[PDB]
Write a protein that binds this ligand. Sequence first.
Ligand SMILES: [Mg+2]
Ligand SMILES: [Mg+2]
Ligand SMILES: [Mg+2]
Ligand SMILES: [Mg+2]
Ligand SMILES: [Mg+2]
Ligand SMILES: [Mg+2]
Ligand SMILES: [Mg+2]
Ligand SMILES: [Mg+2]
Ligand SMILES: [Mg+2]
Ligand SMILES: [Mg+2]
Ligand SMILES: [Mg+2]
Ligand SMILES: [Mg+2]
Ligand SMILES: [Mg+2]
Ligand SMILES: [Mg+2]
Ligand SMILES: [Mg+2]
Ligand SMILES: [Mg+2]
Ligand SMILES: [Mg+2]
Lengths: 239, 76, 98, 124, 243
Amino acid sequence: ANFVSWKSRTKYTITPVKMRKSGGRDHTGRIRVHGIGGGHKQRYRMIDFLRFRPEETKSGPFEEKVIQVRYDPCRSADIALVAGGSRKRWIIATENMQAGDTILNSNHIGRMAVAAREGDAHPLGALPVGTLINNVESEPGRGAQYIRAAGTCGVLLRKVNGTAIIQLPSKRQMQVLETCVATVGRVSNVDHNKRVIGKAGRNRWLGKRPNSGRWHRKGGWAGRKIRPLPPMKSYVKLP
Amino acid sequence: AYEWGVRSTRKSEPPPLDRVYEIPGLEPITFAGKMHFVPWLRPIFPPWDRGYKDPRFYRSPPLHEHPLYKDQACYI
Amino acid sequence: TVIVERWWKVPLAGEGRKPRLHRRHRVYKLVEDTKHRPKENLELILTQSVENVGVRGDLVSVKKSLGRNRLLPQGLAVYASPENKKLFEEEKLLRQEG
Amino acid sequence: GADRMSKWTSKRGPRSFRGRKGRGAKGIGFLTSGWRFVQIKEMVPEFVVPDLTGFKLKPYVSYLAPESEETPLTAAQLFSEAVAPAIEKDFKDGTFDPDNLEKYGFEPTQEGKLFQLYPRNFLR
Amino acid sequence: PLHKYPVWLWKRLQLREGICSRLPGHYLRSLEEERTPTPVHYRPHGAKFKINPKNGQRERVEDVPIPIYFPPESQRGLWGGEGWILGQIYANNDKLSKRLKKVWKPQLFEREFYSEILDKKFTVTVTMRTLDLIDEAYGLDFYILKASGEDLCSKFGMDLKRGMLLRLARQDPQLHPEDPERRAAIYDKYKEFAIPEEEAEWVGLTLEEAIEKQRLLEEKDPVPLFKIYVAELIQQLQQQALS
RNA sequence: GCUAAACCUAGCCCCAAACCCACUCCACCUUACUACCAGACAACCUUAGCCAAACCAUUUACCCAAAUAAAGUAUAGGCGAUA
RNA sequence: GCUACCUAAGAACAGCUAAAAGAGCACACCCGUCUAUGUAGCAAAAUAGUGGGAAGAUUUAUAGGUAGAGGCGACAAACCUA
RNA sequence: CCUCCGCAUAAGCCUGCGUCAGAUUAAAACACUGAACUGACAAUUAACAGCCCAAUAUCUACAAUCAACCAACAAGUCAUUA
RNA sequence: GCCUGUUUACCAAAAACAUCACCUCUAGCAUCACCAGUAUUAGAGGCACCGCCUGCCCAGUGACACAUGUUUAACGGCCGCG
RNA sequence: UUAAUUUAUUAAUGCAAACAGUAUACCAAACCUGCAUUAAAAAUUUCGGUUGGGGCG
Ligand SMILES: [Mg+2]
Ligand SMILES: [Mg+2]
Ligand SMILES: [Mg+2]
Ligand SMILES: [Mg+2]
Ligand SMILES: [Mg+2]
Ligand SMILES: [Mg+2]
Ligand SMILES: [Mg+2]
Ligand SMILES: [Mg+2]
Ligand SMILES: [Mg+2]
Ligand SMILES: [Mg+2]
Ligand SMILES: [Mg+2]
Ligand SMILES: [Mg+2]
Ligand SMILES: [Mg+2]
Ligand SMILES: [Mg+2]
Ligand SMILES: [Mg+2]
Ligand SMILES: [Mg+2]
Ligand SMILES: [Mg+2]
């Protein structure tokens, strides 16, 4: 069962990379996830989610200029080609971000707040309270893993002695260290909720096989569960 | 950061050498004398290079000891 | 160390022969575990002055964890063998004099 | 079912199997980039023929030739007919040394010459 | 028809046939030893005869061992004399319920050990029984030189034993120079040991390693017939010369 | 009277004794029978069940140390079939 | 190597009306609603007529993968060399 | 008189209606002599198609649809330098 | 039965299964699937476009809460005599 | 399956072992090992007789 993964590219490149579908089959060859496979072909645009990484031999904050705002097939929110200095890279795009615009990639955690635009990225210690943020890390320098999908956004709630507390779009709160960078504003491509599929052919185009037809009886879990919101998730380490 | 080299597609690290190479003053009895793999142990091979240079199997020198290497970058 | 006795009574095969087993002599019964035992302590002779667990020269029973992790690897003690017992009591006999 | 018993020749597989098989001819070069074949003249065998002009020896023998006993050549016989008079003679003059055997035809190692015997450099 | 020799004697016949015959004899004794291990996973009987209840008549009693299975991680590090117990179990300790198969694995630890003879710190996948046995033997080196071939249950133990025995047999520059009195002290400490040098090399080998070692000993690319024949010739002329 | 019928001898079986074999030249782990090039991965694991107990749920000889005897005895066993 | 699904890189779809189109008539092709013949038949499931689709959730050439206490399945308890 | 066939490539098989002799026999569902054959003899000749690339770094955002307006979604089938 | 479509190859092509739409439940997350994705997301399911609606019940079971509770678009139930 | 037996397997817990400070007291990080409990998922096996045929009685 020869399954060598398609993600074998050790250098970051702007060029779209050929990707192989899997069909829900893991490395053994059996299905692990049902109802996936056989869509239109796609290519992968390597997104850089560490929004503040300086260029080589440059250290401080740096500026960047938007070139295009494309459509990425591999996600919901569309992406943006961004150029600055002597390199280009794909980043996730925010709402009202068009071409030619100039965005900031800051590191300096100021004394007071900074009245920031809907594009640029500051550390969470410098952002004003109540700001709508997205693409937050969980550790300083990890990379954006939370809010990324189309039109989703997290609010910054309070800034405490060495942390900042974030509310995810699932409303579960999450505190993180003060120096974690996060971009401002909602992610692009709102009204992704309002998409109508229209026919079963589009669901086959997206790469999704239909549901199986065996009638399963609903058990105890199927009722509406009114639960309390889960306790806050802490990534701040304490000795 | 997010490193782009997936572990399954990278070159695997070799297995840890068998424990006879930690015992001092003791030489192991390995299959280098029979020129084929068996189980039960493993040798350590010296580096090899071609004595006579071959144009179809030529390997370049590393880049900072090319004779045209400059520290400052030019832009073609 | 898991100790097990055999249920089903292997039937006593010879003196110069090996016992003949059946697949009912593979049925065991746990007679004791060697964990879940009150752990005894070992004896060490100390070569250096330490904190309240002892002074240099006199042997002392300490817990096996402490004696195996701190006292013996850091050279603070020696095993209480009959060999070095003799040299340590001789050094006691020469340190304290007439 | 396919034909198991008849042997696997070069005429049998698909279009990729044909060409990769060959019939046993020893190759004389290598394939370069643009599917070109580069012949190397030192790999193609050069037939070393002599001049048969004034040669007096026929493919058959006359029946009037007498017979004799067969004796296959042995290494002791080759030693006795090749080296033993020379070593015997220069031992009678007392100049024989066991240290240098190379002056009687012995070679210490075959690594130097062109026709080395034990790994069999030469063809036939 | 029938074989001449039984099937279980073909191993000893293969030892007497070929290159295995040319192994040294003390290695052949140590290979054909076949001695019993000390009890680990069971309690042995006290006496040879055990008067039993329900009739006061004495019976012979033997103690048969448990067939314990040693995985290759037991060969990588010093376990005790213990391994896995692949066996079976009646459910609630009465024989009128189901029979279930049970595996008793030992508890493993990772502790660093020092050796006074090798002067090196090893990381070993030790268990608790080995720690107690090292404490009972007053050292790692005494534990490895003391305990026999059947009780280590590890090839790492036999490699350590051959290394220590070679260090004792050679009287090598062990610790380093600038301290030869410590070398003399450590070599004098473990002196109730130290088999000869030609016997210390064959300690703890498998059969395949010893076969390969003896094969490498007599490797010996052959002599050309020129030297043999010139020796015979000059011997013949010396024989004809002196008469 | 046509189809037909008849044959002995290739060989084989069970034992005893004895431990038994393997490169003429070339090719043969890749698509075996292929003359010729850079990741080196690597083996060590309680048999189960049919069946008997007139079902079946613990249980049921098969295990590789010459014979005979002790003896089908002491023992084990839904103390039962049986071992 | 049939078949159920998936992966890699391919191929095919005359003509007319094209409302824009998992649109309409209709070839090649895929499938098999009904009738008749056949039932040791051409065929261990065919033939002739009549039918549905035929720019798509389509059909198909090559290679590979998922295997039985399982694989796969738009659930027929369907298929896994008649 | 029929043609819904045919000529090629790929896949598959491996000499399987070329000559002479036997045709007394044998398979031709019968025969001549040849597709349900015996022995011998002789052919398929590469430019068509296979069989490939010396390294270390570095570069590769603007589909195809006469690609020119218009218009999109399922976001795509092709490139180098030191 | 919303439609195109899918199935018992070889007696059942359908009102059966799927289908856009709606709803319930689970999950705060990095490298071999899901995914080189992040709660306008992914998975487990019911029902079946659209239009009007989806009434009452937590006694019991299951699930979730451990504050005797919450949950029916969870399993299910929605009276008798004169 | 809400029939009998069982949890060999996974997931949770609790105890023990393993580690460390800690002023006569408290805390027990993560992974393995043994034991005990619960659940999910399973494994083996069975499904009496008379009966003016069988079933109901
Ligand atoms: Mg659904
Ligand atoms: Mg359904
Ligand atoms: Mg006897
Ligand atoms: Mg029975
Ligand atoms: Mg019977
Ligand atoms: Mg259409
Ligand atoms: Mg039509
Ligand atoms: Mg289908
Ligand atoms: Mg059904
Ligand atoms: Mg329908
Ligand atoms: Mg049918
Ligand atoms: Mg069909
Ligand atoms: Mg039908
Ligand atoms: Mg339906
Ligand atoms: Mg309702
Ligand atoms: Mg009856
Ligand atoms: Mg009746």
